Amino acid sequence: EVFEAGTDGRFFAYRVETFDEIPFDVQKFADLVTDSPVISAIIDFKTLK
Amino acid sequence: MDVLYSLSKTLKDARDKIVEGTLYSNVSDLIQQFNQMIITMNGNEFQTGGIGNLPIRNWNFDFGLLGTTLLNLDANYVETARNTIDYFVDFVDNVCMDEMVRESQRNGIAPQSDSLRKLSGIKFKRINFDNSSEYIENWNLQNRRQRTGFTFHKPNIFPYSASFTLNRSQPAHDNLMGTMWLNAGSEIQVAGFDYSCAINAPANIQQFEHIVQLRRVLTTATITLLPDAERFSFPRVINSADGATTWYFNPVILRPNNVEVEFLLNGQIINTYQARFGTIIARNFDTIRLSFQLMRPPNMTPAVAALFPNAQPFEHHATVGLTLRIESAVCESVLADASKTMLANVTSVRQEYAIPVGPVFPPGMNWTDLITNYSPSREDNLQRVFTVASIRSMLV
Amino acid sequence: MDVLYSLSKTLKDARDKIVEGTLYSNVSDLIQQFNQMIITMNGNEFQTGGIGNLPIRNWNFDFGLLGTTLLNLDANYVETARNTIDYFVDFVDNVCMDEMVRESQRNGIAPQSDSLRKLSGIKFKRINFDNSSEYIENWNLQNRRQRTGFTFHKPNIFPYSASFTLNRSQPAHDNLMGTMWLNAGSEIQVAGFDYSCAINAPANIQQFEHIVQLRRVLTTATITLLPDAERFSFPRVINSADGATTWYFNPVILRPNNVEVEFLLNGQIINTYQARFGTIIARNFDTIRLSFQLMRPPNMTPAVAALFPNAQPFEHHATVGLTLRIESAVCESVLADASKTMLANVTSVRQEYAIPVGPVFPPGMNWTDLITNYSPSREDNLQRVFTVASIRSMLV
Amino acid sequence: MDVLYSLSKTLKDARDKIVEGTLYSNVSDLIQQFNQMIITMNGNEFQTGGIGNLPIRNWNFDFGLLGTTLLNLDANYVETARNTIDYFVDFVDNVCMDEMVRESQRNGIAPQSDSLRKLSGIKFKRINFDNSSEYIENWNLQNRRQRTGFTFHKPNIFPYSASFTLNRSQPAHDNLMGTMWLNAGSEIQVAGFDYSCAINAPANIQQFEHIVQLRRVLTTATITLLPDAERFSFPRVINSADGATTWYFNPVILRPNNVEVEFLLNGQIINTYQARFGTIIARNFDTIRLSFQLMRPPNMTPAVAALFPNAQPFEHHATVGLTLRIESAVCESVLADASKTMLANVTSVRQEYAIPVGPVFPPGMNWTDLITNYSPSREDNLQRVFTVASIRSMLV
């Protein structure tokens, strides 16, 4: 499962196998992003879908 | 769903009625239904769990029938029936938990767990019998597309929102005019405040309006309307609209003037109540329009006249209010309320087994988020899980 | 208890179903059960005792069976059945009253009246039939040591206590810091006040904490949490902790900061809610920890800054609040709630007949004292009397 | 549990009684029970262990029976029985281990493992025979909800607690007055100290009190009371309340005065002992209240007078003490004790196989946390695992 945030204020949660948006779970994106590797969204969700 | 409910109802009846010493004439039909359940479920393999921390469990049904002849039930009959009922109740509880923790964007009304999908086959229709509960009755009626009605005591229809609107404001926040409200559960408190007390308003009357859009149509609603909003009637340091600073509120409560409560459906006035406080009835509505006026008292005693000077500073700020409580209502769609425990049951089951956030419901089944965006798919999934929760509550 | 409930249920069914014109097929099983009750009770002498002002009453049963000849019940059949049912209802009501007015320290769950003790003999087991009520279901589950459950709307779980704690105080009560709370029924209102508005706090934050220990574990609880505490948001004159003097409280309500509501079971955090208001679910808990903070506004408009000076005197005292209402919950032990009338029934029966204070319950049947020291003996006796009260209310 | 206990008891009796040369009349009934066990277990597949490091083991039973007509058992008969006994002992040991490593918040008393849940089927009830152990007897009585209790030697009823309370103190900790206690297992040592030796106390008497609340009601308890607390009888350097600094304690032991030990149940004085040392009996209690006094010796020899001056500095601090040891007791709930090995067995099994911490027991099966928060759910699960541990220790 992919969580995504943007400085513009756009956030997206989705699944890797199929790119369908998911209810964004704040307080889980934060715990993931404080420690785990963070990936720049060159090909951000909208382009991926 | 009807088959699962029938299993649960048969087990509940078996627990309640198959007791030591009772006449067999009291349970003859119940024993026949129980035997039909045994026959239908025999030779079937079921699997439950596998989502979150919900454990995988396999169920195989091979039970004999109850066919002993008696006048009054004895300990042997009760013990055998108890063993069978215990196994079946465990199976039904696990199936209900499995179905409660699942959702789908498409066809969320349809069964999600493979156990319930298997139970939805034609071969199991024999298990089906009396469907008398409110939730199963509504389920069957909606399957037939007849009108369905869920009766709620204090429906949880308004998502939590403590907000304010400033119709007149300035950086110092010393001469403000606006409204502040709390919409929570079945309660709507609104307070219109004017710092100048309508000294320069046309006819010394200020007008405040609060429009609340219900996410679902409520019918046969009993409402209690009270003049004052006690929540917005004490001194308060409130944040700025953008949080840049904080302003001061020092209410002095004047009675609301020219109160009109309009209960609207599709923008059409269904019910209107003018200067009526106490118990009122809104027969069918989806919007509430509370319009009330702050009227500067034409005649003031010296103590009152001291509070409202002609010009600034305004140390005391005039405030009118309104409190609206929906004591009871009827809604075609399911909702949380103060008397039922279905939302609590589903949330507890999802939290206990660490169910991952799905594609329909918000994280943690936050009711405010759910009712704010109460979409048709969310409504279907919520109805499904609430029906399953009631079925489970019949036993567990 | 099961036999007494069965008697009451049979009589209720007879009253409801034995009506003029009804088909005998609608009452065949009911008539058979009623006649079994007649046979079992016939030839037995009962006495309901004279504890308190309850009259000593003697009961003899020599009733003939109900007829089975009419295709449709008529007026004569209904009148004869009415006479028999009236006698049996009087007997059952008197037995229930005699049981409700009695308590034991050693075995409170066992019958205390000689009538119910006699009904616990084996020969009366024939009377036993459908046990479908919630209270009797829970009684039977408890007898078997199974997971019991009582669903309460607004459970009366918090004993009444309006108290305050002053973390910082002085003889003149002009620079105070502390909390004041009301824990009443299903409601907890708490308010932390700082007279200095955290001017000298380590980071302009003052931390307030309220710990409420529930006397019994609550499960599947729907809880409404709201920011402000309307009860501690107006000026008050409050007796000192020792009653030697009085102090002045002049609240100005600030938004609570960093609100953490924790629902704990055995000291472990079962549920946690951060800055979440509205409807929340506490799935299983026995303690509530409400942590909030009074944060000095970093930016203030001129009036707000005027409220809070850098040093004494402090005429406006900053206050943050919290309100927590348990709309509904589930508890393994019996409790008083806003819906069921069991506590009222037991108290009314005791007061009507001037029952002397026993060794178990408080000397008024007062719920605050009872729920305060909710001992296992008190719980057993309360379950017994509440079950008997439900049985009686089925008829009376 | 009864079926598992019956398996273990049958295997133990097979080991003990099926011996070379024994008359067949000595084992006829035992051989019948053993053959019944073989018959019932034959054709059944069992699976044990998928939690932690407990390996998955699969059990199949296709064993032959034992002869029934010979006069004296010989080496051939014993050799035939030994292989079956070994396999069944291994199976029962693994089933007991699988059950000991499991817990549930909802139904802790019900079986948790798949194997024990299958053994709860009706067909295995034929294996059931004599349930004569204390733990199984209590299991059955408690299932029937009959008054039953466990007898403990040195019950482990007090969670570890080494603490002190200072009624009189100051930053230099030079003139203190208070109490220090150790609560550990069945032992309470309490010591009240006065640095001034009650020079300024009214009547030259200083009163100390210690209240200990037991988490479960102990009955028929034998207590040893001694007038000195040897734990707090030597010089100590003690951390302050907040750990900011350390203070000095230099006890000089005076005999306690007006010693009163009150054993209370729900706030009611059940037993009272004044100036009684040695063996005392506390028939029924949940609270211990120790009240003692320090009295200045009205007459002092020159050294004693030198110990206690009229004013500071106080170099010798007068201490009175009490020691209370519960030699044996009876409790309706299971507890760890110095004689049984149930807690040790459960802890060892959980540690050896790295059982993940569950939602009921404290991690590592810590007894202090377990008895500090000894909830009904914890009590249920602890009784279950302790009974299983006794069953296992019957063989292993």
Next chain:
Amino acid sequence: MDVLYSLSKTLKDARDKIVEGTLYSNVSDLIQQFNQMIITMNGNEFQTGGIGNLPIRNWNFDFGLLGTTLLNLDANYVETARNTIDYFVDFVDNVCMDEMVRESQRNGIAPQSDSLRKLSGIKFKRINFDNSSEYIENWNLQNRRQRTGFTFHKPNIFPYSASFTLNRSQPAHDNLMGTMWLNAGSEIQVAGFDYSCAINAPANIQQFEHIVQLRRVLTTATITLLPDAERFSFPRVINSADGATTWYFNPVILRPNNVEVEFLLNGQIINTYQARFGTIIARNFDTIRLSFQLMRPPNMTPAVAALFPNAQPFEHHATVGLTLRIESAVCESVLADASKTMLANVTSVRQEYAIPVGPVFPPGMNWTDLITNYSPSREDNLQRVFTVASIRSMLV
């Protein structure tokens, strides 16, 4: 007694062995014994008396025989047996309680209650069967005037006595020499103190002696002997012999020298242990003689030499201790101990029903008074009540 024990044993065996599903071969002898008991007790009237607050209770026995002809016991069988067993167990418990609260100066070994006197008739001897318990076995041995043996863990053989003896003293109490001891339960702590540290002794050796005369002969006793007596190793303020004044004790512990523990029987040395610590065996004794010595260290470092000046004042007082714990032993007479609950049970039954003090036992069944004056009449009555208590504890 044997008939009462047989009733209790039969009922315990019935509760343990008559379980649902068990083979009838497991209970054939038990069912025969139970039917024999039913036949013997049927038609007999019993009355448990009203001594103290113990209620008067009337018992009538009219029960049918337990069935034969079942291959495996079913639920109906167990239910009928449970009803009969419950009535019989209640009767047995009440009879045991009635017997436990009664005593006589002469013929105290004979039954005192009317129920047990009736049960001692010849017509009830049929009920008698296996007498395997230790207490009933010793009862039978005593009835036959054979050697009796009770095994105790930590026998309560020493009455509480904390005393001191001053072999050298004076009004100032600055240069004392003597011994102080505590004898409690199975523990003896003794400490010989010399304030001069044997500076003027004949060979710098001070000899200390302690003789403890046991009031009953103990055989096969294992005893832990340890050098120091921690109870008398810290500073104390001790009342004078007559309480006129108080003296100061400031021990400095030197190791005991030339330790000598003699266990004497009728003034004859049975066991001797010299310089032996740890576990020792006293095979048969009634007196303990502990002879130890304080030897002045011939060589002393400056710190040691500073504590022991040639002449007064003596601020540091030399002490040599000894601890003796009887971990287990065997006695021909009944005693209180840590493991068993006989004394606690008898005392609890006497306290619960407010039995007035009789002419035999000390008030409150105080063990110190009981064993300080353990007369033959007291021994007979105590054995009787303890045997009845064990019989009751088999079922309660």
Next chain:
Amino acid sequence: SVGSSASAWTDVSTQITDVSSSVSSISTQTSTISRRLRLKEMATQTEGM
């Protein structure tokens, strides 16, 4: 904290806030977090380019 536990990466700050457009709280939280995920980019705590 907008996470389970406190972290400098997961702290909310000034955010004068923009009433110009109807803004969700989650959007503000995610934007504030991403503005520090930029320093994650420049702290070798990223995975892809």
